[PDB]
Design a protein around this nucleic acid. Structure first.
Ligand SMILES: [Mg+2]
Ligand SMILES: [Mg+2]
Ligand SMILES: [Zn+2]
Length: 462
RNA sequence: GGUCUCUCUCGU
RNA sequence: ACGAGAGAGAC
């Protein structure tokens, strides 16, 4: 992905989009009870913690483009993945505007607690002024569909969240692209059933983990991924995608039965325009993270990538013996023989991709179930039933969360949720955690789930 | 101050 | 089942 041009909003005639510059995060009552290295992300260019120009660090993720059209490796990869998807019998027909706005059994409704994007977000219009959960009225949408039309600019916001200290010094906050409600509606109408299928079928057929529940899913992964394990994360995945991968996505869609009308929407996310404050810019390549389908398209493009890198890097790769699951740029995968991720990474570099260990270790080592991670969690067989597998979020991560809050009004929910994560790390670790929480006045007011019940309710999921 | 997923809580 | 809130995860 590469920025093409930047023009002042006076010149494009786009409404400014300013977002907040102060974090919602404050230290919590547990801040000094637990150790932690994270702080809120840099939101403002005059942040005393900065050690670089802010805006330049922000947009450095657009590292440029390499390929624009598929080579023979990516064509074969695209096609193999497309065949895999066919057995799913994805309904390529258009989803109704009613189901697209207000949801289905396998697709949540448009988030009405979230911005409506450009232009509404400068016109002081909320999603709730246009949609209504109770009516399921769809006509105020169509009025606006015709008023403002489609392909409306994304609004660039910095993301308010905890980050490691290193990324704060380097001003490397995360950018998200607020989609106009129109485009979200039209994409959900175009790919809602695909969304439904993917959500209902996490695993190695979709090649996706979207819609998985780590508590039950994790016991299946060793069965879905037999053989030698390998794993990846990427650095700046979204912005590092060159247009070739959106082309490859197109072929996949067309192969599984999408009309040329449908397929044509992909170029609309490969070539995007963004408003950031008082400027307009053009990004060619890159996933506009914040468009509808982000997680899923990220994951599909990821399936094409892995396949393409395998058959271009190694001799006599049989793609039918690949098993992989992806969540965005997260990858857990298996193959009948050990895969040298260092060489895959080298080949990924040629295409503009920066591939790293899945734990952001400094080098690629052997991956196995004892050291594998997926969605930050690691894999721990239960000491009584070894075929049941605990998803283990590292306590360190759980400590980072509990030290901050955006509203102390939800301390009890915050702490309980963490508890539901922490207990997988086992009895001794859990009581260590609970103990610390109780060592402070507010902690003694908190309803903390009992370890025994947690484990009992987990077992019964099976 | 986005797309989404999972889970929990509180109501009817 | 429907609403409201939250936490976590991927970009
Ligand atoms: Mg990454
Ligand atoms: Mg990742
Ligand atoms: Zn452009």
């Amino acid at each position: 992905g590469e920025i093409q041009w930047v023009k002042p909003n006076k010149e494009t005639g786009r409404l400014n989009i300013n977002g907040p510059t102060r974090t919602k995060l404050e230290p919590s009552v547990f801040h000094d009870v637990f150790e932690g290295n994270k702080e809120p992300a840099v939101l403002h260019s005059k942040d005393p913690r900065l050690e670089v120009d802010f805006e330049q660090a922000l947009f450095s993720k657009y590292v440029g483009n390499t390929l624009y059209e598929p080579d023979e490796y990516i064509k074969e990869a695209a096609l193999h993945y497309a065949n895999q998807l066919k057995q799913l019998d994805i309904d390529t027909s258009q989803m109704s505007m009613e189901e697209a706005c207000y949801g289905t059994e396998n697709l949540e409704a448009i988030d009405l607690h979230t911005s409506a994007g450009y232009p509404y977000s400068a016109l002081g219009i909320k999603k709730r002024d246009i949609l209504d959960s109770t009516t399921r009225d769809v006509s105020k949408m169509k009025f606006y569909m015709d008023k403002y039309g489609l392909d409306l600019p994304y609004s660039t916001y910095v993301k308010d969240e905890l980050r490691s200290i290193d990324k704060i010094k380097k001003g490397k906050s995360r950018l998200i692209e607020a989609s106009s409600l129109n485009d979200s509606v039209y994409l959900r109408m175009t790919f809602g059933h695909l969304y439904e299928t993917f959500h209902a079928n996490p695993g190695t057929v979709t090649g996706s983990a979207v819609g998985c529940n780590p508590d039950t899913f994790w016991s299946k992964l060793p069965i879905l991924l037999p053989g030698s394990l390998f794993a990846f994360d990427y650095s700046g995945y979204d912005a590092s995608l060159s247009p070739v991968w959106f082309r490859a996505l197109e072929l996949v869609l067309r192969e599984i039965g999408y009309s040329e009308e449908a397929v044509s929407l992909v170029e609309g996310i490969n070539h995007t325009h963004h408003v950031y404050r008082n400027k307009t810019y053009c990004v060619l390549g890159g996933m506009p993270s914040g468009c509808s389908g982000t997680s899923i398209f990220n994951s599909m493009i990821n399936n094409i990538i892995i396949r393409a890198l395998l058959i271009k890097t190694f001799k006599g790769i049989d793609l039918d013996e690949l098993n992989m699951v992806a969540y965005g740029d997260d990858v857990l995968a298996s193959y009948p023989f050990p895969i040298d991720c260092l060489e895959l990474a080298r080949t990924g570099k040629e295409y503009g991709l920066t591939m790293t260990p899945a734990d952001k270790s400094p080098c690629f080592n052997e991956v196995n179930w004892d050291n594998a991670t997926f969605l930050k969690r690691g894999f721990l067989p239960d000491e009584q039933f070894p075929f049941l597998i605990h998803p283990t979020m590292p306590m360190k991560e759980i400590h980072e969360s509990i030290r901050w809050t955006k509203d102390a009004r939800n301390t009890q929910d915050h702490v309980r949720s963490l508890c539901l994560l922490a207990w997988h790390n086992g009895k001794q670790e859990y009581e260590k955690f609970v103990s610390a929480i109780r060592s402070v006045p507010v902690g003694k007011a908190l309803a903390i789930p009992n370890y025994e019940n947690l484990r009992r309710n987990w077992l019964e999921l099976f």
